[PDB]
Amino acid sequence: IPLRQNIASMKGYIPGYQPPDIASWIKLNTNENPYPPSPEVVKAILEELGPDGAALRIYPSASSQKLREVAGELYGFDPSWIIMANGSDEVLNNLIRAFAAEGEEIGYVHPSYSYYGTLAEVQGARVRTFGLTGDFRIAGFPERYEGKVFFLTTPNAPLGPSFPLEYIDELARRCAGMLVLDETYAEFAESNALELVRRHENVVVTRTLSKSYSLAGMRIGLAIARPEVIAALDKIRDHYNLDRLAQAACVAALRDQAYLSECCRRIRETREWFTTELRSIGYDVIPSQGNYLFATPPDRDGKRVYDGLYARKVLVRHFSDPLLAHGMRISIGTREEMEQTLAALKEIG
Amino acid sequence: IPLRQNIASMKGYIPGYQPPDIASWIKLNTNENPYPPSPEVVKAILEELGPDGAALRIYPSASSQKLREVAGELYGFDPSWIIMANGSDEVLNNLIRAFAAEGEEIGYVHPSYSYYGTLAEVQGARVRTFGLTGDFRIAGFPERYEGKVFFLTTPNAPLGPSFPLEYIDELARRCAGMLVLDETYAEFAESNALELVRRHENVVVTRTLSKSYSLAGMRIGLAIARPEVIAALDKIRDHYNLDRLAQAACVAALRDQAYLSECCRRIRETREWFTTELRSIGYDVIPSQGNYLFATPPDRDGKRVYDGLYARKVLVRHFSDPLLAHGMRISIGTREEMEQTLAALKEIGE
Ligand SMILES: [Mg+2]
């Protein structure tokens, strides 16, 4: 039978290419953490699983309230300002379902997370994108944006820069609707915008454990917003959105801030070292606040270099988007992996 | 807060009541399996996790293709006719998003899974429910149902009976939109309706490992439908909807059919024994094809019995709905737990 027209017409999300066999590869294409999650996460999962996995026959916590209390203490927010999710894509999706009816508009920055658009298409919401200027400010933003939701990836991926808090504050005041600050990479930056959730009423911040907590293999994320917004999101989400092992992992991960800090320290160290090394062989590198770098070879032939890396079993991300085709987004792996990647880049020339 | 009107006005799903500390309780309120999952599942999870959880830093299989291949071999369907999900609620939700635009209608049986309505409310779809007749057929069903999606829980929960394949076939032919056969409890039944996915084009079957495979704490579900339907559902779901441990568990669970069969056999045996014992003390028990029973005491005071069980640390499910208030839905636990429950029921009856 007939699907909704928009569902029939839309094209599914197109991820970056990745070969099925990646065992013998240095994988730097999806911004995954180079280090394992906290040893406390492993213990927590094993302890929840038990000797025969009997605990898995019982439904998990629908509320994930214990996760909200731990997250609440970490960020300094009452638990009613927090909601857990099976990865942050879930909250992005539900924010659209909560605020944008079919036909209404949502917006975001080009380039950023193209999936914001895919989610809009499923809802039937219209999409409007805005580009960035040389000094990384939104170009052509109206006096007042009337879209129902605006998604700002901050720090911005794939480019890397963060937006000054005062500038995001301005954007919040100019948005008639909701401003969603996607802070997927904020743990790698020198600052974040959590304070804006308190300063305004239309600001929402999303976080995920996929990048900074080395749990991309698990789907754990959250959103921080005014209680009224969280209340609406709680009615929309599936009553059971996080399994028992994910809940055990989440609490352990958030509690081990020492490990998180050490991992982020090491990644930032490698990021800055690699930035200088790339520039030493003629590459243009955008200063980054995330766990990746957008680099452009001297000849601006990003695909040529991507092919050279692929031939050497090094996988990075290359965008066909004309705006980004000149370079590539390289995730920051272990220092050893980046030394090998640099060696390959030198051979490629 | 500028919320869509339907979102602002809707009431969030209201689950059955359950106390925080029930470690010393006999829990029979959410149809959870009384037995642990397959030992192969525990092994699979341990292997994927590894000694340091290093594998968890890498994203899972976005496609879950391996799971579809295993499920395909189990059910006799090409993998293109299958889609995996983080619990079947996810596929129920996406079926609504795929076929019912705001303002359009979806329907289901009263009583069944009220969450079908909650999901419809989020979408902004209208909801129409139909009651059942004495012979377990849908009362007042139109000659042709025009709703975009009709959800049929089969076996039906909370009542228990499965709808005969022949009758579901009739419903498929009478539905102008999609007919979704929620087979959450089919592994406990004598038969199922998988064949209808092949016979018709508008039929979809959902399954979950939450009840029959003892993995309610690791929500893994799936849907079987024509490739074109699966294709649409694949564009709607999040690219990463199942974690690495869940993918490991799913393959192991589906492959251990011996364990599944044994668990289902033990549950069916306890179910039938308990059914007989309840009738012997005056209860009316609807013949069930699931892992639960809808039982009504001789005095038709289900809430009194529920309260009596609660006082004795036995938790079942009681519905305030006038149609179901006289009885209760009792999940099937271990034989020992049901003997204790029977003893409690006899005392409450006296
Ligand atoms: Mg006594």
Give CA–CA dist B31/B46, Å, rounded: 26
Q: Are residues B191 and B81 in the same domain?
A: yes
- Quote the ligand 1 centre to B288 CA distance (angstroms): 29
Cβ neighbors of B107 (< 8 A, separation 6 or more) are B127, B128, B129, B130, B145, B147, B149, B150, B151
- Quote the ligand 1 centre to A310 CA distance (angstroms): 74
Q: Label residue A144 exposed, middle or buried (CB < 10 Å: 0-12, 13-18, 19+).
A: exposed
Q: Do B39 and A52 touch (CB under 8 A)?
A: yes
Q: Do B99 and A3 touch (CB under 8 A)?
A: yes
Give CA–CA dist B162/B340, Å, rounded: 28
Give CA–CA dist A81/A77, Å, rounded: 6
Following CA atoms A301, A303, A304, A306 in sequence, which dihedral angle do they give, to the nearest 10 degrees? 130
Domain CATH number, residue B276: 3.90.1150.10
Q: Label residue B153 exposed, middle or buried (CB < 10 Å: 0-12, 13-18, 19+).
A: buried
Residues in chain A: 349
Which residues of chain A neighbour B1 with C-beta distances below 8 Å?
A: 201, 226, 228-229, 232
Strand order in the sheet with B203-208: B82-85, B221-224, B203-208, B178-182, B149-153, B105-109, B126-130
Q: Are residues A15 and A44 in the same domain?
A: no
Give CA–CA dist A154/A235, Å, rounded: 27
Q: Do A122 and B235 touch (CB under 8 A)?
A: yes
Instruction: Give the orientation angle of helix B257-280 with respect to helix B244-255, to 10 degrees.
Output: 80
A255: number of CA atoms within 13 Å, CB side?
15
Which residues of chain B neighbour A59 with C-beta distances below 8 Å?
A: 30, 32, 210, 216-217
Split into its structural domains, chain A has a count of 2
Contact of B344 with B308, CB cutoff 8 Å: yes
Q: Do A218 and B58 touch (CB under 8 A)?
A: no
Q: Are residues B117 and B140 in the same domain?
A: yes
Q: Do A37 and B53 touch (CB under 8 A)?
A: yes
Q: What are phi and psi of B232, to 5 degrees?
A: -70, -45
Give CA–CA dist A82/A288, Å, rounded: 28
Q: In chain A, which residues are last before a break of more than 2.5 Å from C to the next N?
A: none
Q: Are residues A248 and A319 in the same domain?
A: no
Nearest to A37 among B32, B33, B56 (CB): B56
- Quote the ligand 1 centre to B24 CA distance (angstroms): 18
Nearest to A56 among B37, B99, B176 (CB): B37
The tokens describing B202, both together, are 């508008």
Give CA–CA dist A141/A288, Å, rounded: 23
Residue of B nearest to A30 (CA): B59
Nearest to A7 among B37, B42, B236 (CB): B236
> What is the DSSP code (8-state) at residue A342?
H
Residue of A nearest to B54 (CA): A36
Contact of A104 with A118, CB cutoff 8 Å: no
Q: Are residues B261 and B195 in the same domain?
A: no
Of the candidates B208, B312, B172, B244, the one whose C-alpha atom is nearest the C-alpha of residue A238 is B208
Residue of B nearest to A209 (CA): B57
Which residues of chain B neighbour A93 with C-beta distances below 8 Å?
A: 238
Domain boundary among the residues B207, B231, B256 is at B256
Give CA–CA dist A205/A197, Å, rounded: 7
Q: Are residues A161 and A128 in the same domain?
A: yes
Domain boundary among the residues A228, A256, A284 is at A256
Contact of B11 with A235, CB cutoff 8 Å: yes
Residue of A nearest to B121 (CA): A236
Domain CATH number, residue B48: 3.40.640.10
Domain boundary among the residues B224, B256, B288 is at B256
3-state secondary structure of A257: helix
Nearest to B245 among A12, A226, A245 (CB): A245
Q: Are residues B347 and B314 in the same domain?
A: yes
Give CA–CA dist B187/B261, Å, rounded: 9
Nearest to B62 among A15, A97, A243 (CB): A15
Which one-letter amino acid corresponds to residue B329? R
Give CA–CA dist A279/A183, Å, rounded: 27
Which residues of chain A neighbour B26 with C-beta distances below 8 Å?
A: none
* Stated resolution in angstroms: 1.6
Q: Label residue A277 exposed, middle or buried (CB < 10 Å: 0-12, 13-18, 19+).
A: middle
Q: Do A36 and B52 touch (CB under 8 A)?
A: yes
Give CA–CA dist A277/A26, Å, rounded: 18
Contact of B185 with B157, CB cutoff 8 Å: yes
**CB-based neighbours (< 5 A) of ligand 1, an ion:** B 347
Which residues of chain B neighbour A89 with C-beta distances below 8 Å?
A: 238-240
Which residues of chain B neighbour A239 with C-beta distances below 8 Å?
A: 13, 15, 89, 115
Q: Are residues B192 and B52 in the same domain?
A: yes
Q: Are residues A236 and A327 in the same domain?
A: no
Q: How far is B204 from chain A (nearest CA, A)?
A: 12
Interface probe with A: pick from B59, B244, B267, most Cβ of A within 10 Å: B59
Contact of A188 with A267, CB cutoff 8 Å: yes
Q: Are residues B166 and B218 in the same domain?
A: yes
Burial letters A208-228, b for 16+ CB under 10 A, else e = bbbbbbbbbbbbbbbbbbbee
- Quote the ligand 1 centre to B347 CA distance (angstroms): 6
- Quote the ligand 1 centre to B346 CA distance (angstroms): 9
Which residues of chain A neighbour B59 with C-beta distances below 8 Å?
A: 30, 32, 210, 216-217
Size of interface A-B (CB pairs under 8 A): 215
Which residues of chain A neighbour B87 with C-beta distances below 8 Å?
A: 238, 240
Give CA–CA dist A218/A39, Å, rounded: 15
Nearest to A217 among B12, B56, B238 (CB): B56
Residue of B nearest to A47 (CA): B46
The β-bridge partners of A150 are: A107, A179
Beta pairing, strands B149-153 & B105-109: parallel
Residue of A nearest to B90 (CA): A238
Residue of A nearest to B200 (CA): A1
Using what technique was this structure determined? Answer: X-ray
Residue B304: domain span: 1-36+257-350
How far from A248 is each of A41, A218, A245, CA to CA, in Å? 7, 11, 5
How far from A301 is each of A18, A174, A321, CA to CA, in Å? 20, 38, 13
Residue of B nearest to A34 (CA): B57
Q: Are residues A202 and A77 in the same domain?
A: yes
Q: Are residues A153 and A220 in the same domain?
A: yes
3-state secondary structure of B299: coil
Give CA–CA dist A65/A92, Å, rounded: 20
